[PDB]
Design a protein around this ligand. Structure first.
Ligand SMILES: CSC[C@H]1O[C@@H](n2cnc3c(N)ncnc32)[C@H](O)[C@@H]1O
Ligand SMILES: CSC[C@H]1O[C@@H](n2cnc3c(N)ncnc32)[C@H](O)[C@@H]1O
Ligand SMILES: [Fe+3]
Lengths: 353, 353
């Protein structure tokens, strides 16, 4: 049948797992939008897999490109009618953007945050950077505070291009803040921000999470936040080490996981690492909580090379799910060394480096 | 000294795991509200554990019961001051109630649902029943439809005091519906509802999920929904069997899991069952998505016997998180017979039976 031929054609182009649902998700997204960035967004499939599906549909005559937009052909409209694939409806809450939390009480914080981060360091390609919107950062504080994880708590920030530590300083909630980053620009900027605010209880240092954390970072914190790369190795280096910073049971962890650069097959492996290797429980998984500001190095990335139509994104297409985890009896972090180079950031499903 | 004495006293009263965070969660909730049901709600700890913590604090002189409110004593205010335990903040979106989806576009469906469910069967004690609000039922449809899991899909409903199958019939989205329940009253009510709507593509049958599902249920459906009891046996009998109804990879499952009757230790156990035994991925975990209507048999339950302040709830205190799961390569369900009595519903963490 029609669908077997499509799936077979997609498997020729990628090693990323392909199911009938993969094809449905892309076809549903195409009926909603012709923008290739938005098709990745609305399908919730990883970009390289979406490209393979779009290329397969293009080759078999189910889609055409017109004005740099992917549209269903006559044969494409027959296919979606035959298989009952409608356009993907969206009922995301317009007030909270689907975040579950409203930031009406943090209007002063948002205002202060925007002004102090006016000249924030722009995203570096080498360190897989892309900062979230000011509204996302404030929503993170609201979320973390609503779960009782900030007020009088010792908070660890593993990597901080998002400048969550700056928002945490302005909130006045933590007892103390620890923040690290491989990028010198961010540690200097956060130090400058702390000096301007007059914030005493912050420890800032440069560090490569390829190395094991020193003793002063281990077993001494109540909450951690990180927004990591999505190789399984990077999950251990960022989230795993984040769990190692926590004192013991009853401590929290916050991090983003995309559908843009991780398939649901990798989600299963990531969740198995969390539940089996680190013994933590996942308390929340919130769709598109984090909205990322578009990054200037887009044209130098794998995504730009892969895409059949190459136009700079016109909106914030890239989003991630917010994970919350909590430690229990028998939880543990990651304390071993990692020696990979670019494979920390890059795998078959990644495209934004 | 202070906290260890409390933790030791709680461990004498229950075998449910107790951490310092358990005590913090309850004390934070006490500061926000004196209502015992609201303390269970805001603490997000299971009811019997909350009872043990409250009774321990009461005996050690930290709380008192005044006008049927759990209030902090002068010693209690010193305790929360000493450990830096603030009152639990909450920034839950007032438009969607934290559900992530709004039901503005389903106002007609809500009106139709309320009309046809005026004389719905009231919740029976023996089958652990309590139906969600009509707003919740419509929100479920919006959520499931937004992820592409209803339109032209074959949907299985394992247990339906919530009457999700009636809402699904009214929506006109499914290709067909299959629904089962142990309660004859509900199967007959859905029958009468189906004949009243003139809905042809629904199969209704009475069934005990202790038994393995028959041939015609297995591997023929795209989506399932269930709202199960929270013993590990019940998760296998409801959610596991739900997974067994799904055709293969790329199929969806929806279910509620409470913090009211399951500790986070049991959440880790349940998540391990989902990821390791069934091999499914968890795509969403949304806090307090399901709001339950208070049930008339409350005074006959374990909760009433445990509560140190015996007053009926004044609001819908009982809520559950919405889980979404998806099947992948190598996912499988549960197909064995279970031989248990009341232990299907009851364990040490349960209290609403
Ligand atoms: C992955 S992007 C999130 C943050 O992590 C930082 N980061 C990237 N790689 C590393 C690393 N190996 N060690 C520490 N921080 C890193 C980036 O500079 C950014 O601020
Ligand atoms: C657990 S409450 C959710 C729904 O499941 C139903 N239910 C409870 N126990 C069983 C069982 N053993 N088999 C099938 N359905 C059940 C109830 O009647 C209710 O409608
Ligand atoms: Fe909302």
């Amino acid at each position: 049948s029609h669908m077997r031929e499509i799936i077979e054609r997609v498997k020729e182009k990628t090693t990323i797992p392909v199911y009938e649902r993969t094809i449905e998700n892309v076809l549903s997204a195409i009926q909603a939008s012709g923008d290739v960035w938005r098709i990745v967004d609305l399908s919730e499939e990883p970009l390289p897999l979406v490209v393979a599906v779009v290329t397969a549909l293009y080759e078999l005559g189910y889609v055409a490109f017109e004005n740099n937009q992917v549209i269903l052909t006559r044969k494409g409209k027959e296919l979606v009618e035959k298989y009952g694939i409608g356009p993907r409806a969206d009922y995301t809450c317009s007030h909270c953007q689907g975040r579950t939390v409203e930031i009406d009480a943090f209007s002063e914080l948002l205002e202060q945050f925007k002004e102090i981060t006016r000249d924030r360091p722009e995203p570096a390609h080498q360190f897989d950077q892309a900062y979230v919107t000011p509204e996302t950062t404030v929503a993170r504080v609201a979320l973390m505070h609503s779960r009782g994880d900030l007020e009088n708590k010792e908070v660890f920030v593993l990597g901080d291009d998002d400048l969550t530590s700056v928002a945490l300083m302005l909130s006045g909630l933590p007892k103390r803040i620890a923040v690290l980053d491989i990028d010198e620009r961010l540690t200097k900027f956060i130090e400058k921000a702390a000096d301007e605010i007059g914030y005493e209880n912050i420890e800032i240092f440069t560090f490569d999470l390829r190395k094991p954390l020193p003793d002063y970072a281990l077993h001494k914190f109540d909450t951690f936040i990180t927004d990591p790369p999505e190789t399984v190795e990077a999950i251990r280096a960022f989230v795993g080490r984040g769990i190692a910073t926590l004192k013991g049971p009853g401590c929290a962890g916050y991090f983003g996981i995309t559908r843009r650069e991780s398939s649901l097959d990798k989600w299963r492996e990531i969740q198995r690492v969390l539940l089996n290797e680190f013994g933590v429980v996942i308390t929340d998984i919130i769709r598109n909580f984090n909205e990322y500001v578009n990054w200037g190095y887009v044209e130098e990335t794998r995504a730009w090379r892969l895409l059949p139509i190459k136009v700079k994104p016109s909106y914030n297409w890239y989003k991630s799910y917010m994970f919350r985890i909590q430690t229990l009896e028998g939880s543990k972090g990651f304390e071993d060394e990692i020696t990979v180079g670019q494979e920390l950031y890059d795998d078959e499903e990644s495209s934004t480096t």
